[PDB]
Write a protein that binds this ligand. Structure first.
Ligand SMILES: O=c1[nH]cnc2c([C@@H]3O[C@H](CO)[C@@H](O)[C@H]3O)c[nH]c12
Ligand SMILES: [Zn+2]
Length: 349
């Protein structure tokens, strides 16, 4: 029985962490690019994980399959279309999906990701391709889907271009910029490309989210908020380690994009402490529940909703509350945000 069988909102899910294994196999074969396995089941076992790794050890899983998607236009549109297909099945009415356009390009991107041969797919092309597959997905399945473009921590030289792509594709479908990748890279929040991207975003009214406090110190969160000027924090669990900062963000009504299942598997949460999400619920924080990389974690949104119901006693009422909070914190323009809120209340009566 599904933990919560009513419309849900999802803010934090990576397109390139949410690809069908069957579709990765399909493209490895069509293109003749290697894969670490040859049937769907063995691919799941290898790419997927059921025991905690460190964050760099988790991020390496992408290496297995990205090469089979990157630089292939049919593949990029197709994963975006099937993304909407999946989320529609899970009873999501609105979802913001994030990716790095540079990590899927094979032209005008330096350093060339994945040791690719120069092709014709620029980062600008990737966005348009993903827009296309999402819009087709919307027309087919009738849920609302927007996109978030990721700066990557290790590559601040892409960040100004990420910001320009957010400006160019604003609300079609790109609603925000994000900062993702290896949180453990010393001082990465302050690399000049990242700081200046986020400054340009403030100055041009481009929405902002930042992965912080997944494995880092509370200081990485404080940097997301006070220097980068984020409006939402991805994860944020390790914020509680700093009491004054947690309380400031509570008072200022910061949104935390919690990914509970993600949390165990990246070793961000110790299974024999209280998940920070329990504290968020008792404090009536502003947070959402998110699958983060469902392909790698072998999960669906119900996975995270089951985890919190079974292991943390989340009620139907708390589920409705945090989705209402997720809607309020979405990056939709005002009239679409009101429309979403109207729908959630109607459906929750
Ligand atoms: O758990 C995570 N923490 C930090 N970054 C990532 C991404 C990174 O964002 C890029 C675009 O989605 C992915 O390619 C991955 O490197 C995936 N999952 C996580
Ligand atoms: Zn993430």
């Amino acid at each position: 029985t599904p933990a919560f069988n009513k419309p849900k909102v999802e803010l934090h899910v990576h397109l390139d962490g949410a690809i069908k294994p069957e579709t990765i196999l399909y493209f490895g074969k069509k293109r003749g690019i290697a894969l670490p396995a040859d049937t769907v089941e063995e691919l799941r076992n290898i790419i997927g994980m059921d025991k905690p790794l460190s964050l760099p050890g988790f991020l390496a899983k992408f290496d297995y399959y990205m090469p089979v998607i990157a630089g292939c236009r049919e593949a990029i549109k197709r994963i975006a279309y099937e993304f909407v297909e999946m989320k529609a099945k899970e009873g999501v009415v609105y979802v913001e999906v994030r990716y790095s356009p540079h990590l899927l390009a094979n032209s005008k991107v330096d350093p060339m990701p994945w040791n690719q041969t120069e092709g014709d797919v620029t980062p600008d092309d990737v966005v348009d391709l993903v827009n296309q597959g999402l819009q087709e997905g919307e027309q087919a399945f009738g849920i609302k889907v927007r996109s978030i473009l990721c700066c990557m921590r290790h590559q601040p030289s892409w960040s100004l271009e990420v910001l320009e792509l957010c400006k160019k594709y604003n609300q079609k479908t790109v609603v925000a910029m994000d900062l993702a990748g290896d949180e453990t890279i010393e001082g990465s929040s302050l690399f000049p490309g990242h700081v200046e991207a986020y400054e340009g975003a403030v100055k041009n009214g481009i929405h902002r989210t930042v992965h912080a406090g997944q494995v880092g110190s509370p200081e990485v969160v404080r940097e997301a908020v006070d220097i980068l000027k984020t409006e939402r924090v991805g994860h944020g669990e390790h914020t509680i380690e700093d009491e004054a900062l947690y309380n400031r963000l509570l008072k200022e009504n910061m949104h935390f994009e919690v990914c509970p299942w993600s949390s165990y598997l990246t070793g961000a949460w110790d299974p024999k402490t209280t998940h920070a999400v329990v504290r968020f619920k008792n404090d009536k924080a502003n947070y959402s529940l998110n699958t983060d990389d469902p392909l790698i974690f072998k999960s669906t949104l119900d996975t995270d909703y089951q985890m919190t119901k079974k292991d943390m006693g989340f009620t139907e009422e708390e589920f409705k509350r945090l989705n209402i909070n997720a809607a309020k914190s979405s990056f939709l323009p005002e009239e679409e945000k009101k429309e979403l809120l109207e729908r959630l209340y109607r459906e929750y009566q």
